[PDB]
Scaffold this motif. Sequence first.
Motif, PDB file in Angstrom:
ATOM      1  N   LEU A 130      10.387   6.079   8.805  1.00  0.00           N
ATOM      2  CA  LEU A 130      10.418   6.501   7.403  1.00  0.00           C
ATOM      3  C   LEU A 130       9.031   6.692   6.775  1.00  0.00           C
ATOM      4  N   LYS A 131       8.107   5.737   6.976  1.00  0.00           N
ATOM      5  CA  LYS A 131       6.823   5.761   6.270  1.00  0.00           C
ATOM      6  C   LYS A 131       5.790   4.753   6.779  1.00  0.00           C
ATOM      7  N   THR A 132       4.555   5.213   7.003  1.00  0.00           N
ATOM      8  CA  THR A 132       3.457   4.350   7.430  1.00  0.00           C
ATOM      9  C   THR A 132       2.620   3.880   6.236  1.00  0.00           C
ATOM     10  N   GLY A 133       1.823   2.841   6.468  1.00  0.00           N
ATOM     11  CA  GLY A 133       0.813   2.446   5.501  1.00  0.00           C
ATOM     12  C   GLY A 133      -0.300   1.688   6.187  1.00  0.00           C
ATOM     13  N   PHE A 134      -1.469   1.656   5.536  1.00  0.00           N
ATOM     14  CA  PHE A 134      -2.595   0.860   6.028  1.00  0.00           C
ATOM     15  C   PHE A 134      -3.635   0.681   4.934  1.00  0.00           C
ATOM     16  N   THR A 135      -3.997  -0.569   4.670  1.00  0.00           N
ATOM     17  CA  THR A 135      -5.260  -0.930   4.049  1.00  0.00           C
ATOM     18  C   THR A 135      -5.832  -2.095   4.843  1.00  0.00           C
ATOM     19  N   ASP A 136      -7.101  -2.415   4.592  1.00  0.00           N
ATOM     20  CA  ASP A 136      -7.663  -3.617   5.198  1.00  0.00           C
ATOM     21  C   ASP A 136      -6.811  -4.840   4.877  1.00  0.00           C
TER      22      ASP A 136
ATOM     23  N   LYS B  46      -0.149  -0.729  17.198  1.00  0.00           N
ATOM     24  CA  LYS B  46       0.657  -1.941  17.315  1.00  0.00           C
ATOM     25  C   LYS B  46       1.831  -1.962  16.335  1.00  0.00           C
ATOM     26  N   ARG B  47       1.696  -1.349  15.148  1.00  0.00           N
ATOM     27  CA  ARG B  47       2.847  -1.295  14.237  1.00  0.00           C
ATOM     28  C   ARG B  47       4.006  -0.521  14.853  1.00  0.00           C
ATOM     29  N   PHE B  48       3.689   0.463  15.690  1.00  0.00           N
ATOM     30  CA  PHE B  48       4.684   1.212  16.436  1.00  0.00           C
ATOM     31  C   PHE B  48       5.198   0.425  17.636  1.00  0.00           C
TER      32      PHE B  48
ATOM     33  N   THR C   9       4.501  12.958   4.673  1.00  0.00           N
ATOM     34  CA  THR C   9       4.091  13.226   6.048  1.00  0.00           C
ATOM     35  C   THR C   9       2.690  12.689   6.338  1.00  0.00           C
ATOM     36  N   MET C  10       1.686  13.172   5.606  1.00  0.00           N
ATOM     37  CA  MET C  10       0.305  12.776   5.858  1.00  0.00           C
ATOM     38  C   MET C  10      -0.148  11.621   4.975  1.00  0.00           C
ATOM     39  N   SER C  11       0.693  11.164   4.045  1.00  0.00           N
ATOM     40  CA  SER C  11       0.340  10.063   3.139  1.00  0.00           C
ATOM     41  C   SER C  11      -0.892  10.422   2.302  1.00  0.00           C
TER      42      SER C  11
ATOM     43  N   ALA D 200     -10.141   7.664   0.394  1.00  0.00           N
ATOM     44  CA  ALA D 200      -8.704   7.880   0.498  1.00  0.00           C
ATOM     45  C   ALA D 200      -8.393   9.222   1.157  1.00  0.00           C
ATOM     46  N   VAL D 201      -7.285   9.268   1.896  1.00  0.00           N
ATOM     47  CA  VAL D 201      -6.799  10.518   2.473  1.00  0.00           C
ATOM     48  C   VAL D 201      -6.282  11.402   1.344  1.00  0.00           C
ATOM     49  N   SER D 202      -6.892  12.576   1.168  1.00  0.00           N
ATOM     50  CA  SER D 202      -6.557  13.440   0.042  1.00  0.00           C
ATOM     51  C   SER D 202      -6.257  14.855   0.515  1.00  0.00           C
TER      52      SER D 202
ATOM     53  N   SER E 205       2.606  14.615  10.487  1.00  0.00           N
ATOM     54  CA  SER E 205       3.196  13.329  10.140  1.00  0.00           C
ATOM     55  C   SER E 205       2.387  12.200  10.771  1.00  0.00           C
ATOM     56  N   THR E 206       2.274  11.081  10.044  1.00  0.00           N
ATOM     57  CA  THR E 206       1.662   9.862  10.554  1.00  0.00           C
ATOM     58  C   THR E 206       2.601   9.051  11.434  1.00  0.00           C
ATOM     59  N   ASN E 207       3.882   9.417  11.485  1.00  0.00           N
ATOM     60  CA  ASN E 207       4.885   8.687  12.261  1.00  0.00           C
ATOM     61  C   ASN E 207       4.829   9.168  13.704  1.00  0.00           C
TER      62      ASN E 207
ATOM     63  N   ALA F  34       0.810  -1.216   0.000  1.00  0.00           N
ATOM     64  CA  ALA F  34       0.000   0.000   0.000  1.00  0.00           C
ATOM     65  C   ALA F  34       0.846   1.270   0.000  1.00  0.00           C
ATOM     66  N   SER F  35       0.648   2.145   0.995  1.00  0.00           N
ATOM     67  CA  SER F  35       1.260   3.471   0.970  1.00  0.00           C
ATOM     68  C   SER F  35       2.778   3.440   1.101  1.00  0.00           C
ATOM     69  N   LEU F  36       3.360   2.310   1.522  1.00  0.00           N
ATOM     70  CA  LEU F  36       4.814   2.185   1.477  1.00  0.00           C
ATOM     71  C   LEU F  36       5.354   2.389   0.068  1.00  0.00           C
ATOM     72  N   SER F  37       4.503   2.209  -0.951  1.00  0.00           N
ATOM     73  CA  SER F  37       4.853   2.537  -2.333  1.00  0.00           C
ATOM     74  C   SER F  37       5.364   3.964  -2.488  1.00  0.00           C
ATOM     75  N   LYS F  38       4.913   4.874  -1.627  1.00  0.00           N
ATOM     76  CA  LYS F  38       5.283   6.277  -1.774  1.00  0.00           C
ATOM     77  C   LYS F  38       6.775   6.501  -1.578  1.00  0.00           C
ATOM     78  N   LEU F  39       7.484   5.550  -0.958  1.00  0.00           N
ATOM     79  CA  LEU F  39       8.929   5.687  -0.870  1.00  0.00           C
ATOM     80  C   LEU F  39       9.570   5.584  -2.242  1.00  0.00           C
TER      81      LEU F  39
HETATM   82  C1  AIX Z   1      -1.501   4.202   2.321  1.00  0.00           C
HETATM   83  O1  AIX Z   1      -1.441   3.121   2.828  1.00  0.00           O
HETATM   84  C2  AIX Z   1      -2.790   5.062   2.474  1.00  0.00           C
HETATM   85  N1  AIX Z   1      -3.882   4.123   2.785  1.00  0.00           N
HETATM   86  C3  AIX Z   1      -5.208   4.354   2.260  1.00  0.00           C
HETATM   87  O2  AIX Z   1      -5.430   5.315   1.600  1.00  0.00           O
HETATM   88  C4  AIX Z   1      -6.313   3.342   2.555  1.00  0.00           C
HETATM   89  N2  AIX Z   1      -6.942   2.984   1.291  1.00  0.00           N
HETATM   90  C5  AIX Z   1      -7.404   3.881   3.469  1.00  0.00           C
HETATM   91  C6  AIX Z   1      -7.326   3.864   4.850  1.00  0.00           C
HETATM   92  C7  AIX Z   1      -8.386   4.361   5.593  1.00  0.00           C
HETATM   93  C8  AIX Z   1      -9.509   4.857   4.949  1.00  0.00           C
HETATM   94  C9  AIX Z   1      -9.583   4.862   3.565  1.00  0.00           C
HETATM   95  C10 AIX Z   1      -8.526   4.366   2.818  1.00  0.00           C
HETATM   96  C11 AIX Z   1      -2.533   6.151   3.468  1.00  0.00           C
HETATM   97  N3  AIX Z   1      -1.431   5.606   4.505  1.00  0.00           N
HETATM   98  C12 AIX Z   1      -2.186   5.251   5.706  1.00  0.00           C
HETATM   99  C13 AIX Z   1      -1.256   5.263   6.775  1.00  0.00           C
HETATM  100  O3  AIX Z   1      -0.176   5.910   6.641  1.00  0.00           O
HETATM  101  O4  AIX Z   1      -1.461   4.610   7.837  1.00  0.00           O
HETATM  102  C14 AIX Z   1      -3.396   6.427   5.783  1.00  0.00           C
HETATM  103  C15 AIX Z   1      -4.548   5.896   6.633  1.00  0.00           C
HETATM  104  C16 AIX Z   1      -2.840   7.709   6.397  1.00  0.00           C
HETATM  105  S1  AIX Z   1      -3.838   6.669   4.415  1.00  0.00           S
END
Ligand code: AIX
Length: 244
Positions: A195-201, A230-232, A90-92, A67-69, A181-183, A34-39
């Motif tokens: 360095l960088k957070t991420g989250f999807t289901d 918990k990731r922290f 910072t805010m992903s 999505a966070v926009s 920052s999400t960190n 997921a958002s780790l791709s941003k690196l």
């Molecule tokens: C990268 O992983 C991003 N994740 C998402 O956009 C998910 N699709 C999402 C989460 C919650 C609600 C809707 C969509 C961003 N990185 C995450 C993170 O750093 O923990 C985020 C929640 C800030 S969004």
Amino acid sequence: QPNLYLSANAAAVYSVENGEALYEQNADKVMPIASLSKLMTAFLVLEAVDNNELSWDEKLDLVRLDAVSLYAITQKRTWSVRDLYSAMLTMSANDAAETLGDRLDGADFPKEMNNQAKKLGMSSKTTFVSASGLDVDGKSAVSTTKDLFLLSSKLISTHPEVLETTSKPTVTTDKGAKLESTNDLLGSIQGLDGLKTGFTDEAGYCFIGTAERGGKRVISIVLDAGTAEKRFKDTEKLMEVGFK
Ligand SMILES: *C(=O)[C@@H](NC(=O)[C@H](N)c1ccccc1)[C@@H]1N[C@@H](C(=O)O)C(C)(C)S1
């Protein structure tokens, strides 16, 4: 070799000096990132500035997500490359990441991400699909902790100034916008500057950490922890192992 009892499904911490594992759990397992791709997007933005192909002051209009926009939070569509890069890290902000990738290579940006992945020694188990890490046509960005370590280490050694941004709990833009920052570990673990957070289901709660003490830098990878905290917690354990 004591167990850490981590939340994460896959986790590891490596010494940068020799690339050697100090702890590994499912280090070869293909995992959604997921958002780790941003690196990787960050890496390719920084290569572009260095190669005289991208200006920090160029103004770009945020691409629209399906999505966070950054746009939703601010209702401002136009941003400098600098601030788009800060928002991505910072805010992903997904739309920030996608705007940067589109400026760099249009539709062809994922091909460029995977071209660069092979160039930086990442295995063929790594697949990028988008600048933000959002799914594309149902496909997901995937990697392993070993491949993520190589990406991060290469990013930090090639572009150490990335840490100037990732170390800040708040980045304030020139015009006063404060990007949080999400960190949450910044200012908690000594020496930690990325360095960088991420989250999807599907990916769960993920985080790539990095810290340095007295010349020694470590990189920690946490994938698929069960809560945002918990990731922290896992990172704290891994960072203790890294500086033992
Ligand atoms: C990268 O992983 C991003 N994740 C998402 O956009 C998910 N699709 C999402 C989460 C919650 C609600 C809707 C969509 C961003 N990185 C995450 C993170 O750093 O923990 C985020 C929640 C800030 S969004």
